[PDB]
Amino acid sequence: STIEEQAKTFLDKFNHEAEDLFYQSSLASWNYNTNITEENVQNMNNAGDKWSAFLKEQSTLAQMYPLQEIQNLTVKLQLQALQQNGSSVLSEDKSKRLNTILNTMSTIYSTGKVCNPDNPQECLLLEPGLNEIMANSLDYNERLWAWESWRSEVGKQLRPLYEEYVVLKNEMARANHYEDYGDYWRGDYEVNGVDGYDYSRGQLIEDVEHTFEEIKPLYEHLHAYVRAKLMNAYPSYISPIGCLPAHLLGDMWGRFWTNLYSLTVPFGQKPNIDVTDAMVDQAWDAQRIFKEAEKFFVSVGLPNMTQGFWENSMLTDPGNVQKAVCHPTAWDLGKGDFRILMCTKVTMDDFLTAHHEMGHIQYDMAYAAQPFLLRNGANEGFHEAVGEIMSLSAATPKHLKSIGLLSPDFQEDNETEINFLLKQALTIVGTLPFTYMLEKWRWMVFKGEIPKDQWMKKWWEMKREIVGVVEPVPHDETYCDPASLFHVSNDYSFIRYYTRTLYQFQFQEALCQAAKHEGPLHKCDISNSTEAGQKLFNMLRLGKSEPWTLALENVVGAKNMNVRPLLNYFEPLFTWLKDQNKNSFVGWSTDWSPY
Amino acid sequence: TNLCPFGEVFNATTFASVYAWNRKRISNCVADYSVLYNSTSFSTFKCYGVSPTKLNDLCFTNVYADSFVVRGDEVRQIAPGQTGKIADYNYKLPDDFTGCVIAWNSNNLDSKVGGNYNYLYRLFRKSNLKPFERDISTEIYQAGSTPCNGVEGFNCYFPLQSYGFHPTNGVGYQPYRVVVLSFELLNAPATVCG
């Protein structure tokens, strides 16, 4: 018998045997999350290491069948997925020390203690205060103190490890037949063997840069506006032509610009839309929020929620006798078990977080008819894209008037429209240059075009040409600020956010074009349009079955990520920014310094 | 003459798996199919070859009742002219089957905390069964061409694999009890006339 059928038999047995161990490990970790106790941690890590040992033996058995004889592509996808060796490649001591490095870097970042010089008997962490100080302060020197102290301390404490962490991960990459660790990260977008849809691992770069140019004309002008208003708050440090400093932008790193809605509002004497009071007036609760959530999806032509969803999930914090961790999560436990974990409050933000999570759950329901190994999104951006385009539709004034939260005499005008577009812009367009620059620098450190002695230099020598943020304290090579961020310190990929933004606005444009909507695009809502629902489902049910290029061409009519939907969504803001900056200096020069 | 025991087949205390399915003969009795028809306790009640309403006014030579436990998704494979693991290697209904298939949910009875692994099914074989055959063999199935001599290893697997029934699984992965009533009518004396 050809190795064709032998491999398929192996895969069939593997699926039927792996579903069960997945389910038990899953229910164990769930019960740990919804009730914290050392016994539950015991159960959780036991079931987990059982599942890991299972997958290791299955891979070491699967390596045998060579995939130069298989022509069916689903079989090839599954065998390639299962064949990946993982950290079991390298020697015993290398794996030992590398895992130790990862765990100790995560632990030391999570246990940062910084102490102020005026109160040496009180020292504070990062996540409660430090974040609160830098988010909700209006003082310059104190913010610079917090920022410099945190970055200097944890960067000097972390860098010696990350330094050779680099080369260990690089050799772990190289052994598996790759050029650099960056190639291993980029491989998530690779597609070959289907004519007309191949996508090299390098092509991504040549795409992500070719898009960024088109995104700068809108960005540059925003960076003028955010700067100009900021000149009124700190009128003793900022330049009319220079860049923004680091400690004036909100979060500790500047990953978003959402904390600046106070000092950068277009028309301040106009309030935004907030229906918290309208909810507590009508005495809503968790059940009502989640019922409206499922109603929105039933309207579009998608399934209802499982009965086990209502029975077993936890939609309220359970009191003080039972503890939990209530980061909002959407759980797929296997065997048709779908749940949600959320400590909900009666607010406006949770109204949209519920839609985000139920979109995750809907994706998981759609691809549950595929083999076990092919149960994921097309790539690492699709889950978040499908989750976000739902909040984007449920957050319009039209849907909120339909639900009966806002009285139908709420009239909106160009000031509230510009308000919404600016609040969206700060958090969507302001995260893209930072993301692109960060992962470009990681790629260049991994590929080796940034020698060690220059590393930090080009970091800032990138921030001034892409993002336009200059450093308040001069740093030499003994500092390491990029290692401070949680994502970089704990080995996660980061381009998923860029591709997520682009796919998100492409999906929105395509859907609410087919959904019979004319006008400005940020008003489009897909409630009550089954036509768009089926067009979305014909992309959701595929999973990792076929290349993401076709999974995207099905719904948008295109084979690559494009920015025209995003620039179209922000054109009502572009028109206003051009006139507001008709007199001010647009752009920035690297010739300025804050010190 | 005698009302015959549908109660020993439907409300039994124990059921058997689908590789070793229980077959019991119904003879010389008067049956009451109206009890079964509108009991509204059965998830699916589908009859091929006979209309469900005219069943009582008909006389049969030999009636058989087969019972087993399957998964929720697999009940559609119990029908004439379908494919799948259960229809190939477990239970084959002919392309001319005259009789009824009943299946109802048993999560209250057949599931437990921690799971219930006592219902088994065969996954591999060397051929497809022809109608109404049973295979109870527990020999090791080689997938390729190299011998393994009665001991598992590479390309040799055990044919039987066990269900896992938890109380929390979805509808599709939940236990269903299935009873298949097979009728045969020919020129002999009668046995079951309702």
Side-chain angles (χ1 to χ4, degrees), chain A residues 304-319:
Chain A
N304 292 10
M305 289 299 168
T306 298
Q307 185 174 60
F309 184 109
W310 301 115
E311 285 158 7
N312 296 132
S313 72
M314 163 182 295
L315 303 191
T316 313
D317 191 291

PDB file of all heavy atoms in Angstrom, chain A residues 304-319:
ATOM      1  N   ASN A 304     -27.445  29.972  16.767  1.00  0.00           N
ATOM      2  CA  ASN A 304     -27.733  30.502  18.092  1.00  0.00           C
ATOM      3  C   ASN A 304     -26.625  29.969  18.983  1.00  0.00           C
ATOM      4  O   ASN A 304     -25.723  29.279  18.512  1.00  0.00           O
ATOM      5  CB  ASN A 304     -29.064  30.007  18.632  1.00  0.00           C
ATOM      6  CG  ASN A 304     -30.243  30.558  17.879  1.00  0.00           C
ATOM      7  OD1 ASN A 304     -30.095  31.175  16.829  1.00  0.00           O
ATOM      8  ND2 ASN A 304     -31.433  30.321  18.408  1.00  0.00           N
ATOM      9  N   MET A 305     -26.681  30.255  20.265  1.00  0.00           N
ATOM     10  CA  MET A 305     -25.686  29.787  21.215  1.00  0.00           C
ATOM     11  C   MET A 305     -26.154  28.460  21.803  1.00  0.00           C
ATOM     12  O   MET A 305     -27.348  28.203  21.975  1.00  0.00           O
ATOM     13  CB  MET A 305     -25.422  30.795  22.326  1.00  0.00           C
ATOM     14  CG  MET A 305     -24.666  32.013  21.852  1.00  0.00           C
ATOM     15  SD  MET A 305     -23.052  31.558  21.202  1.00  0.00           S
ATOM     16  CE  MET A 305     -22.555  33.077  20.405  1.00  0.00           C
ATOM     17  N   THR A 306     -25.183  27.612  22.108  1.00  0.00           N
ATOM     18  CA  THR A 306     -25.413  26.281  22.638  1.00  0.00           C
ATOM     19  C   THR A 306     -26.086  26.379  24.007  1.00  0.00           C
ATOM     20  O   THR A 306     -25.980  27.386  24.707  1.00  0.00           O
ATOM     21  CB  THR A 306     -24.078  25.534  22.713  1.00  0.00           C
ATOM     22  OG1 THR A 306     -23.540  25.404  21.394  1.00  0.00           O
ATOM     23  CG2 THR A 306     -24.236  24.144  23.296  1.00  0.00           C
ATOM     24  N   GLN A 307     -26.811  25.325  24.382  1.00  0.00           N
ATOM     25  CA  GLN A 307     -27.432  25.300  25.698  1.00  0.00           C
ATOM     26  C   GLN A 307     -26.379  25.243  26.792  1.00  0.00           C
ATOM     27  O   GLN A 307     -26.546  25.839  27.867  1.00  0.00           O
ATOM     28  CB  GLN A 307     -28.380  24.113  25.802  1.00  0.00           C
ATOM     29  CG  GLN A 307     -29.167  24.070  27.093  1.00  0.00           C
ATOM     30  CD  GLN A 307     -30.203  22.963  27.107  1.00  0.00           C
ATOM     31  OE1 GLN A 307     -29.870  21.785  26.976  1.00  0.00           O
ATOM     32  NE2 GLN A 307     -31.467  23.337  27.269  1.00  0.00           N
ATOM     33  N   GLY A 308     -25.282  24.538  26.535  1.00  0.00           N
ATOM     34  CA  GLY A 308     -24.210  24.483  27.511  1.00  0.00           C
ATOM     35  C   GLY A 308     -23.584  25.840  27.745  1.00  0.00           C
ATOM     36  O   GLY A 308     -23.044  26.107  28.819  1.00  0.00           O
ATOM     37  N   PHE A 309     -23.646  26.710  26.739  1.00  0.00           N
ATOM     38  CA  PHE A 309     -23.196  28.086  26.908  1.00  0.00           C
ATOM     39  C   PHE A 309     -23.932  28.751  28.056  1.00  0.00           C
ATOM     40  O   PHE A 309     -23.321  29.397  28.911  1.00  0.00           O
ATOM     41  CB  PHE A 309     -23.411  28.851  25.603  1.00  0.00           C
ATOM     42  CG  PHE A 309     -22.907  30.260  25.615  1.00  0.00           C
ATOM     43  CD1 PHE A 309     -21.806  30.610  24.883  1.00  0.00           C
ATOM     44  CD2 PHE A 309     -23.575  31.244  26.311  1.00  0.00           C
ATOM     45  CE1 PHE A 309     -21.362  31.892  24.879  1.00  0.00           C
ATOM     46  CE2 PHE A 309     -23.129  32.524  26.311  1.00  0.00           C
ATOM     47  CZ  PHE A 309     -22.027  32.848  25.593  1.00  0.00           C
ATOM     48  N   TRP A 310     -25.255  28.609  28.087  1.00  0.00           N
ATOM     49  CA  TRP A 310     -26.040  29.246  29.135  1.00  0.00           C
ATOM     50  C   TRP A 310     -25.881  28.514  30.458  1.00  0.00           C
ATOM     51  O   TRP A 310     -25.858  29.138  31.523  1.00  0.00           O
ATOM     52  CB  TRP A 310     -27.508  29.303  28.722  1.00  0.00           C
ATOM     53  CG  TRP A 310     -27.737  30.039  27.457  1.00  0.00           C
ATOM     54  CD1 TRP A 310     -28.194  29.529  26.291  1.00  0.00           C
ATOM     55  CD2 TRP A 310     -27.511  31.429  27.225  1.00  0.00           C
ATOM     56  NE1 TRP A 310     -28.274  30.512  25.342  1.00  0.00           N
ATOM     57  CE2 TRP A 310     -27.857  31.690  25.896  1.00  0.00           C
ATOM     58  CE3 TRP A 310     -27.049  32.481  28.018  1.00  0.00           C
ATOM     59  CZ2 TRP A 310     -27.759  32.950  25.339  1.00  0.00           C
ATOM     60  CZ3 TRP A 310     -26.949  33.726  27.468  1.00  0.00           C
ATOM     61  CH2 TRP A 310     -27.301  33.954  26.141  1.00  0.00           C
ATOM     62  N   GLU A 311     -25.770  27.190  30.414  1.00  0.00           N
ATOM     63  CA  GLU A 311     -25.699  26.438  31.659  1.00  0.00           C
ATOM     64  C   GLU A 311     -24.349  26.626  32.338  1.00  0.00           C
ATOM     65  O   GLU A 311     -24.284  27.059  33.494  1.00  0.00           O
ATOM     66  CB  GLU A 311     -25.951  24.955  31.401  1.00  0.00           C
ATOM     67  CG  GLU A 311     -27.401  24.611  31.127  1.00  0.00           C
ATOM     68  CD  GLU A 311     -27.559  23.305  30.387  1.00  0.00           C
ATOM     69  OE1 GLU A 311     -26.547  22.597  30.208  1.00  0.00           O
ATOM     70  OE2 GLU A 311     -28.696  22.984  29.985  1.00  0.00           O
ATOM     71  N   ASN A 312     -23.256  26.316  31.640  1.00  0.00           N
ATOM     72  CA  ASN A 312     -21.995  26.085  32.339  1.00  0.00           C
ATOM     73  C   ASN A 312     -21.132  27.337  32.456  1.00  0.00           C
ATOM     74  O   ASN A 312     -20.293  27.417  33.358  1.00  0.00           O
ATOM     75  CB  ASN A 312     -21.236  24.958  31.648  1.00  0.00           C
ATOM     76  CG  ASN A 312     -21.975  23.636  31.718  1.00  0.00           C
ATOM     77  OD1 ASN A 312     -22.126  22.941  30.714  1.00  0.00           O
ATOM     78  ND2 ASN A 312     -22.449  23.286  32.909  1.00  0.00           N
ATOM     79  N   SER A 313     -21.304  28.312  31.570  1.00  0.00           N
ATOM     80  CA  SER A 313     -20.452  29.491  31.596  1.00  0.00           C
ATOM     81  C   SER A 313     -20.674  30.350  32.838  1.00  0.00           C
ATOM     82  O   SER A 313     -21.651  30.196  33.572  1.00  0.00           O
ATOM     83  CB  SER A 313     -20.686  30.317  30.341  1.00  0.00           C
ATOM     84  OG  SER A 313     -21.939  30.966  30.393  1.00  0.00           O
ATOM     85  N   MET A 314     -19.740  31.271  33.066  1.00  0.00           N
ATOM     86  CA  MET A 314     -19.765  32.167  34.215  1.00  0.00           C
ATOM     87  C   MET A 314     -19.827  33.597  33.705  1.00  0.00           C
ATOM     88  O   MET A 314     -18.837  34.116  33.183  1.00  0.00           O
ATOM     89  CB  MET A 314     -18.536  31.961  35.099  1.00  0.00           C
ATOM     90  CG  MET A 314     -18.272  33.075  36.069  1.00  0.00           C
ATOM     91  SD  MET A 314     -16.779  32.793  37.024  1.00  0.00           S
ATOM     92  CE  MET A 314     -17.259  31.342  37.955  1.00  0.00           C
ATOM     93  N   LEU A 315     -20.992  34.230  33.852  1.00  0.00           N
ATOM     94  CA  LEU A 315     -21.226  35.568  33.330  1.00  0.00           C
ATOM     95  C   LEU A 315     -21.391  36.600  34.438  1.00  0.00           C
ATOM     96  O   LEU A 315     -21.826  37.722  34.170  1.00  0.00           O
ATOM     97  CB  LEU A 315     -22.451  35.579  32.421  1.00  0.00           C
ATOM     98  CG  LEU A 315     -22.398  34.623  31.243  1.00  0.00           C
ATOM     99  CD1 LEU A 315     -23.534  34.912  30.295  1.00  0.00           C
ATOM    100  CD2 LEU A 315     -21.070  34.732  30.536  1.00  0.00           C
ATOM    101  N   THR A 316     -21.068  36.247  35.677  1.00  0.00           N
ATOM    102  CA  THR A 316     -21.071  37.199  36.775  1.00  0.00           C
ATOM    103  C   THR A 316     -19.903  36.872  37.691  1.00  0.00           C
ATOM    104  O   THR A 316     -19.518  35.710  37.843  1.00  0.00           O
ATOM    105  CB  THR A 316     -22.396  37.159  37.531  1.00  0.00           C
ATOM    106  OG1 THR A 316     -23.477  37.174  36.593  1.00  0.00           O
ATOM    107  CG2 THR A 316     -22.521  38.360  38.446  1.00  0.00           C
ATOM    108  N   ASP A 317     -19.325  37.907  38.297  1.00  0.00           N
ATOM    109  CA  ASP A 317     -18.339  37.515  39.297  1.00  0.00           C
ATOM    110  C   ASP A 317     -19.039  36.841  40.474  1.00  0.00           C
ATOM    111  O   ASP A 317     -20.031  37.365  40.990  1.00  0.00           O
ATOM    112  CB  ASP A 317     -17.553  38.721  39.788  1.00  0.00           C
ATOM    113  CG  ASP A 317     -16.355  38.335  40.630  1.00  0.00           C
ATOM    114  OD1 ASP A 317     -16.550  37.839  41.760  1.00  0.00           O
ATOM    115  OD2 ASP A 317     -15.211  38.528  40.167  1.00  0.00           O
ATOM    116  N   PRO A 318     -18.547  35.691  40.914  1.00  0.00           N
ATOM    117  CA  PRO A 318     -19.357  34.827  41.782  1.00  0.00           C
ATOM    118  C   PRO A 318     -19.364  35.211  43.251  1.00  0.00           C
ATOM    119  O   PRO A 318     -19.766  34.404  44.093  1.00  0.00           O
ATOM    120  CB  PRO A 318     -18.712  33.452  41.583  1.00  0.00           C
ATOM    121  CG  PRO A 318     -17.300  33.759  41.271  1.00  0.00           C
ATOM    122  CD  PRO A 318     -17.306  35.034  40.482  1.00  0.00           C
ATOM    123  N   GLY A 319     -18.936  36.418  43.585  1.00  0.00           N
ATOM    124  CA  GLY A 319     -18.894  36.809  44.979  1.00  0.00           C
ATOM    125  C   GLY A 319     -17.486  36.760  45.547  1.00  0.00           C
ATOM    126  O   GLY A 319     -16.490  36.663  44.822  1.00  0.00           O
TER     127      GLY A 319
END
